[PDB]
RNA sequence: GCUUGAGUCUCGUAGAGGGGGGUAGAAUUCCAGGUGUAGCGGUGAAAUGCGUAGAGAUCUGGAGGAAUACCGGUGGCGAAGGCGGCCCCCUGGACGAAGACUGACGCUCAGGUGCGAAAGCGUGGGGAGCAAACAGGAUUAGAUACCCUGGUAGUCCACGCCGUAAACGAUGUCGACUUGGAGGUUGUGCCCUUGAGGCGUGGCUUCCGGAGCUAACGCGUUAAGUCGACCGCCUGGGGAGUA
RNA sequence: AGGAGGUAAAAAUGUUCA
């Protein structure tokens, strides 16, 4: 739910809290932890390549499991876990034979609750089986886009894919962007939107409340000198160029899609 | 327990298979107690107009008398198997036992 | 709603007999016993306000048959309620 | 709606185009949509039909026709 | 050519205009003919005997399919629908069955509010 | 004129449709009661088993297929 | 204490009463492809616009959102606002039937609380059609209007707010009594279903009218008639339902 | 007797008093 705090302090005036009373207050599953370094948007040469990235809290990697692999073998919804790399929650669930695995947390899903993968599953919030045993017009998410890959699509907070077409060995996805996309049937998905939908709702209010979210000031190009930005200069704010990136190449309107061999798949662009 | 007319129409192809899912069904709800009255298989007539394709299609009316919590899950097997095409459930009203 | 087995047991529980339902004592735990009923019909759904303009009939009701029954025999009155969980 | 009459015809006599609807209900989704004057004009429409036959009941004055 | 026998042809009469189309029984167009093709430009466009020149102007430019029979489904309203079947059956053609296909809904859209 | 299972007590069925289609026209339109001089009670009975047989195609939504 | 006030229980009846979740067909727009060819669209006329990059028309398939033809009627239900394709689930109220039961718990009700068309507002979605604003084309003395081509918010969905309408039978609520006629709609009893029924007994409702009443118009057993109970409100027009 | 289809672009103003 939302709850929008009391302005008892100049940036805690604005903010809005997304409270979700039922996660597991505890510390993690150990088994199913491993560091994560950050990296502060900069690569093997040493070179802030990605900027505005830095800073904020250490949060350790939760071993989410996309592929479901485990098939024919009956889980059950132990608890309701916070994810701070991810955007929405996380469940961890305990198989039958004694297997404890994190995954991604559907819309209506409580701690008791029983689900299980492969072709033999049923049709109901978390299960997750191949798209051609999915009736058309289903709303699914974490949808692998390879046999085995893994989950690329609707893994966001509050998303999910819609198939409209499922003609012949290809079903016709559409995206959350409103973009429509052959994959391939046997690709696996799970049933349901994804949880934390109030995620959006969200109202961060301080500057440091995006400092430890790992974000960092971010510089308009108006302000800068003309050595430093495409835009710069001016004396008293004097724009009159076309809107550009640092590196001369025209935002605000240029399409930069080139990949000609994923071209195949796309059947409708997104607008 | 209330009285329902459950009726389906089913797939031609599936047509010679109906017979098996006449008495699967009715496995599940005997099973919980729910009482049958009829099972009055119309066989394979001629539509009125043409739905998602192929004419003359297969109707099947069952007319079960169950508690809610049977039917439920009957329903959800019609929405997820394309052998059944555009079924419908009613009220009771002293189910019947003829009228063909 | 209440039906037919349902309300049996109540007319024979707060009644002299299995015949007399009309008393007052009768009545009330009726009531009480439909309106605990519908607090889960307006635990979700939220926006029936139709049938909420039922509930609140109903519940005042109990009210004015709650005053009579006190200004009436103030001893029936006092095993009444401590009997149902209720007068805050 | 499918006159055919097969085989000796050799004119229209579509008289259930004049029928059915083909004119009343096509000329009445034309423009117009009111939302509330169908209402009005519901009423008037039998105000006027409740009149006519009040005096179809009442026209024995004499008139000397 | 391909040479055609049976045909159909559909006649859109509408409010202003009555543009005819012959085309064969699988839906294939082959020719047509309009009220406001054959000249008669603003208020004469909208008249029956406008009607009458579309079907006599389509009645030809449809020779080099040869069509024996044909079927009439007229659509719309419109100031001809009625006397444009007779200059289409006094043509010379052989009218085996008159349909109505007016597309009307069952309350799908909201129409405009127009013409005050 | 004539009248219908107001005497001889009986219930609509919307699987009967050997008499449904002597209550609507063959252009697959309801005909109003002012025609069929059918009580109003029935009617509504009629109509919606006109509808629930729609539904299951056992009567047409109209003659145009 | 008693029962004609009022309420409860048993069995049924009709119903767009209310909330939630699915579903169907026609139609509109859009998208792709085939056939095919100079117009199409619009109007009082015309132009903008659309079209030889091949529209419109026509055929097949697909994607969507909204509204539910016929039934449908001065019909029904709801406190009012208001509510209609169909289906299921949760649920309110009214009415009739033959009895029992409680025994004045009743009526009204300042303040208070709730619900309350449409437009409008906040957050997030959706967006076919329609359409403020806006644009262009016309009309015109002028036309930031009426008409035409387009078109954003909005209209639709979830959760909150606003609390206003000629929110109107312009008629406050409850109860009692006071000649009739013609219909609709929804129960039931009695007699022979002796044949599309007949005579009564209730609920609701439409129209016409007598006494009476009213300034008149008209109302007229759902009264604006004859009385009683309580509440709200008015005190010349404008200023002003404003400061 | 019972229901439908069709029938007007544009035309501003008139001193106060009797």
Same mark, same amino acid.
């Given at each position: 739910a939302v709850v929008k705090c009391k302005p008892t302090s100049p940036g805690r005036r604005h903010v809005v809290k997304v409270v979700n *009373?039922? &996660? @597991?207050?505890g510390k993690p599953f150990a088994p199913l932890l491993e560091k994560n370094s950050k990296s502060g948007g900069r690569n093997n040469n040493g070179?802030? !390549? !990605?900027? @505005?990235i830095g800073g904020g809290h250490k949060q350790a990697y939760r071993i989410v #499991?996309?592929?479901?692999?485990? #098939? $024919?073998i009956p889980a059950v919804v132990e608890r309701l876990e916070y994810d701070p790399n991810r955007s929405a929650n996380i469940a961890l669930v305990l198989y039958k034979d004694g297997e404890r695995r994190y995954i991604l947390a559907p819309? $209506? &899903?409580?701690? $008791?609750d029983q689900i299980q993968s492969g072709v033999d599953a049923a049709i109901k919030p978390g299960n997750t089986l191949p798209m051609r045993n999915i009736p058309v017009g289903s709303t699914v998410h974490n949808?692998?886009?390879? *046999? $085995?890959?893994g989950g690329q699509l609707a893994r966001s907070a509050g998303t999910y894919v819609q198939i409209v077409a499922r003609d012949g060995a290809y079903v016709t996805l559409r995206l959350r962007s409103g973009e429509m996309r052959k994959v391939e049937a046997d690709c696996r998905a799970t049933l349901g939107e994804v949880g934390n939908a109030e995620h959006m709702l969200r109202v961060l209010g301080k500057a440091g409340a995006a400092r430890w979210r790992g974000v960092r000031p971010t510089v308009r190009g108006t302000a800068m000198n003309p050595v430093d930005h495409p835009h710069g200069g001016g004396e008293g704010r004097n724009f009159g160029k076309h809107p550009v990136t640092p590196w001369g190449v025209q935002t605000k309107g240029k399409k930069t899609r080139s990949n000609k061999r994923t071209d195949k798949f796309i059947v409708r662009r997104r607008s | 327990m209330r009285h329902y007319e459950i009726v389906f129409m089913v797939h031609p192809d599936q047509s010679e298979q109906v017979p098996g899912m006449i008495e699967r069904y009715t496995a599940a709800i005997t099973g919980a107690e729910g009482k049958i009255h009829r099972l009055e298989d119309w066989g394979r007539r001629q539509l009125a107009y043409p739905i998602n394709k192929l004419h003359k299609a297969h109707y099947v009316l069952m007319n079960v008398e169950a508690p809610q919590e049977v039917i439920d899950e009957l329903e959800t097997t019609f929405r997820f198997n394309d052998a059944v095409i555009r079924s419908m459930v009613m009220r009771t009203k002293h189910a019947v036992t003829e009228a063909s | 709603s209440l039906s037919t087995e349902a309300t049996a047991k109540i007319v024979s529980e707060f009644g002299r007999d299995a015949n007399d339902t009309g008393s007052t004592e009768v009545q009330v735990a009726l009531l009480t016993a439909q309106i605990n009923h519908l607090q889960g019909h307006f635990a979700e759904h939220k926006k029936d306000h139709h049938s909420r303009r039922g509930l609140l009939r109903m519940v005042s009701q109990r009210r004015k048959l709650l005053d009579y029954l006190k200004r009436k025999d103030v001893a029936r009155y006092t095993q009444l309620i401590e009997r149902l969980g209720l007068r805050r | 709606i499918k006159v055919r009459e097969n085989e000796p015809f050799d004119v229209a006599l579509r008289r259930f185009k004049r029928s059915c609807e083909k004119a009343g209900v096509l000329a009445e989704v034309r423009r117009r949509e009111f939302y509330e004057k169908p209402t009005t004009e519901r009423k008037r429409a039998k105000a006027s039909a409740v009149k006519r036959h009040a005096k179809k009941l009442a026209r024995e004055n004499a008139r000397r026709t | 050519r391909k040479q055609v026998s049976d045909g159909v042809a559909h006649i859109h009469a509408s409010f202003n205009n009555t543009i005819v189309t012959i085309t064969d029984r699988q839906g294939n167009a082959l020719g047509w003919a309009t009220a406001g093709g054959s000249g008669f430009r603003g208020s004469r466009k909208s008249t029956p005997f406008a009607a009458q020149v579309a079907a006599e102007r389509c009645a030809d430019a449809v020779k080099e399919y040869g069509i024996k029979n044909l079927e009439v489904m007229v659509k719309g309203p419109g100031p001809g629908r009625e006397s444009t079947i007779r200059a289409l059956n006094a043509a010379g053609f052989r009218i085996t069955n008159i349909t109505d296909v007016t597309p009307i809904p069952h309350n799908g859209c909201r129409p405009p509010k127009k013409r005050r | 004129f004539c009248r219908f299972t107001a005497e001889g007590v009986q219930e609509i069925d919307y699987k009967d449709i050997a008499t449904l289609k002597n209550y609507i026209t063959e252009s697959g339109k309801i005909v109003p009661? /002012?025609?069929?001089?059918? /009580?109003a009670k029935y009617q509504r009975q009629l109509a919606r088993a006109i509808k629930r047989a729609r539904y299951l195609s056992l009567l047409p939504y109209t003659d145009r297929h």
């Open positions: *009373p039922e &996660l @597991h207050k070179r802030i !390549t !990605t900027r @505005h #499991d996309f592929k479901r692999n485990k #098939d $024919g819309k $209506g &899903l409580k701690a $008791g949808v692998e886009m390879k *046999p $085995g890959k | - | - | - | - | 009661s /002012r025609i069929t001089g059918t /009580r």
